[PDB]
Structure formats: structure tokens, C-alpha cells
């Protein structure tokens, strides 16, 4: 779900690191974001961000 999150934003904004075997999404650079509000179409991650 970290990758689906990283695709609902301008691509540089959510940098998906690999802290453990699992993948964590982190907000690397908020400034690159264009307001496209494409998370709000996800219906499961509009509650997370």
C-alpha cells in the first residue's frame, strides 16, 4: 500500500524506504506536491494522509 500511496502523489513526495523486510512510505519532500487530490479517490488511504 506504500507504493499505491507513492503513486497518488507527484512521484518525489512520498519516498518509500525499506526499513525492514516490509516497505515503509515516508514523506520525503512535501514541496514537489501538485494538488491533484488523487488519494481522495483511493477510499482506504484517504483516512491515512
Amino acid at each position: 500500500a506504500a507504493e499505491e500511496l507513492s503513486r497518488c502523489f507527484s512521484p518525489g513526495v512520498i519516498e518509500v524506504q525499506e526499513v525492514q523486510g516490509k516497505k515503509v512510505a515516508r514523506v520525503a519532500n512535501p514541496r514537489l506536491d501538485t494538488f491533484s487530490r488523487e488519494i481522495f479517490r483511493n477510499e482506504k488511504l484517504k483516512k491515512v494522509v
Partner: protein, 51 residues
């Protein structure tokens, strides 16, 4: 020695020339249906924010 009326004909034949029907195949169109408009592959964003 003249011409006289003879016996009435017993039947009539009417001839016409006719060809026949082929199988129904119903080949509607070369490239058929209304083919849908669609996505160019990959595309990519052609615009970025400032900063």
C-alpha cells in the same frame, strides 16, 4: 380451307429464368463496430510544480 377455332387449351405454362439464394453469412463491416478511443502507453507527466 380457312382457319377455324380449335379445342381450348387444357393448360398454361409460364417460363421465367431464376437464380438461387446463398448461405447467410452477414459480414457486416471490414473493420467492424465503433472501435474505442484509448490511452497512449506510458504517456508520463508533461508538467511539474515550481520548487
Amino acid at each position: 380451307g380457312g382457319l377455324t377455332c380449335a379445342s381450348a387449351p387444357q393448360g398454361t405454362l409460364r417460363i421465367l429464368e431464376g437464380p438461387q439464394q446463398s448461405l447467410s453469412g452477414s459480414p457486416l463491416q471490414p473493420i467492424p463496430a465503433s472501435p474505442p478511443p484509448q490511452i497512449p502507453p506510458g504517456l508520463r507527466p508533461r508538467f511539474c510544480a515550481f520548487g
